Structure formats: C-alpha cells, structure tokens
C-alpha cells in the first residue's frame, strides 16, 4: 500500500482489516494497468466489455 497511492480500496467477501491481518493457505495476486476513467467495467455484478 505504501509503494503506490490507492485511488480506491474495496474488498468483497472479506473484511479490509481481515485481508491485512488474516492467515490464508495461499495468496494469488494480479497486477495490470487499468484506466481511472473506466472503473465500472471491472465489477463482478456488472458485465462490462
């Protein structure tokens, strides 16, 4: 979190406090360039292109 300023932080099915401090068997993470103008498309409920 310190390395990059965060425009938005949202956690689903898990607490933000829990994600910071919980025990998980495995961690899988994806990093990619995503535009600020289009943030609506990346929503599980929504079906953007």
């Amino acid at each position: 979190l310190s390395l990059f300023s965060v425009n938005d932080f949202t956690c689903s099915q898990i607490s933000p406090a829990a994600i910071a401090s919980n025990c998980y068997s495995s961690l899988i993470l994806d990093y990619f360039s995503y535009p600020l103008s289009m943030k609506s498309d990346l929503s599980v409920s929504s079906a953007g292109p």
Binding site: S21, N22, C23
Partner: protein, 50 residues
C-alpha cells in the same frame, strides 16, 4: 445355551436396538459437531478469521 448368535433372531433385535441408540446419538450430535457444513469450525471466525 449352545447358540446365542445368528440362530437367535431375538438376539439380533437386541443388537439392532443397541446399534440404533448409539448410531442416533453419534449422527445427531458428533457428526453435526465440528464440520456441520462441508467445512465448519462449529462457529464463524473462531480465531484466525476476523
């Protein structure tokens, strides 16, 4: 006196009654305790989860 097992149908009924009481107690409470769902700790977020 000689045969008290397969020959006695009544003996099998006593065995069934003992089996039924033990089976009902274990299935209703012991099996439900621990993993009630596919995975359960008996309550949500017991320690590690928050």
């Amino acid at each position: 006196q000689t045969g008290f097992t397969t020959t006695n149908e009544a003996f099998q009924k006593v065995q069934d009654a003992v089996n039924n009481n033990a089976q009902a107690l274990s299935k209703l409470a012991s099996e439900l305790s621990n993993t009630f769902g596919a995975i359960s700790a008996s309550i949500g977020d017991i320690i590690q989860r928050l």
